[PDB]
Amino acid sequence: MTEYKLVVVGAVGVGKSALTIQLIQNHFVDEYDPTIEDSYRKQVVIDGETCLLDILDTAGQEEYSAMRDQYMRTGEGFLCVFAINNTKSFEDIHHYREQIKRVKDSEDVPMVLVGNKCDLPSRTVDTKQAQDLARSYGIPFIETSAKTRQGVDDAFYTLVREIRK
């Protein structure tokens, strides 16, 4: 069965770990420690092909990581996560996309833009602004809620579909 090395990137507190745990464990976490960088795995069925997900949930980017750099060189898809209530996280997408382009040495890498915490009533980051950025990058944009599971499978599924292409 096929293995996909997925990298989850984005600013601290956007809900990367909360997304990873909702996908693999089917449970929401409030409080998950913000510097634990682990790679969780998950067997799924995507479009009739049993396949294995090997997801790195980046944390602690402040400090250096041997295994994080190795995941970045080798990784196959990227989830670029921002929070819909954090304008700084949206701005940081620019730096993450550019960093991926440089480590991978390629204008075209499998990527999905994720606007997390869409379960939330107040929203500082407009749907059009996010859709325009994804449309300028030529990549899908998916709204997600790690709390309600909305769009969570879709985000990880679409990325696997983008690697197949």
Ligand X SMILES: Nc1nc2c(ncn2[C@@H]2O[C@H](COP(=O)(O)OP(=O)(O)O)[C@@H](O)[C@H]2O)c(=O)[nH]1
Q: Footprint of ligand X on this chain (CB under 6 A)?
A: 12-18, 29-32, 34, 59, 116-117, 119-120, 145-147
Going residue by residue from 61 to 100, which x/- string records binding to other proteins, judged by CB under 8 A?
A: ----xxx--x------------------------------
Let me know: does 57 contact 38? Beta carbons within 8 Å.
yes
Share of the chain residues as helix, strand and coil, in percent rounded to the nearest 5? 35, 25, 40
Q: Which does 146 bind (CB under 5 to 8 A by kind): ligand X, Mg ion, other proteins, none?
A: ligand X
Asked if 17 is part of the footprint of Mg ion (rule: CB under 5 A), the reply reads yes
| Residue 30 beta carbon to ligand X: minimum distance, rounded to whole angstroms | 4
Asked if 146 is part of the footprint of Mg ion (rule: CB under 5 A), the reply reads no
Beta bridge partners of 77: 6
Per CB under 8 A, which of residues 22..51 are in contact with other proteins? Answer: 25, 29-33, 35-41
- CA distance readout (Å), 141 to 70, 79, 163: 26, 10, 15
- CA distance readout (Å), 61 to 50, 57, 64, 80, 142: 32, 11, 7, 14, 24
Asked if 157 is part of the footprint of other proteins (rule: CB under 8 A), the reply reads no
Q: What string of DSSP letters covers 7-39?
A: EEEESTTSSHHHHHHHHHHS---S---TT---E
Asked if 2 is part of the footprint of other proteins (rule: CB under 8 A), the reply reads no
**66 Cβ contact partners less than 8 Å away, ≥ 6 residues apart:** none
Is the CB of 22 or the CB of 164 nearer to ligand X?
A: 22
Number of residues that bind other proteins (CB under 8 A): 19
Decide: helix, strand or coil at residue 85.
coil
Asked if 20 is part of the footprint of Mg ion (rule: CB under 5 A), the reply reads no
Residues that bind other proteins (CB under 8 A): 21, 25, 29-33, 35-41, 52, 65-67, 70
Residues that bind Mg ion (CB under 5 A): 17, 59
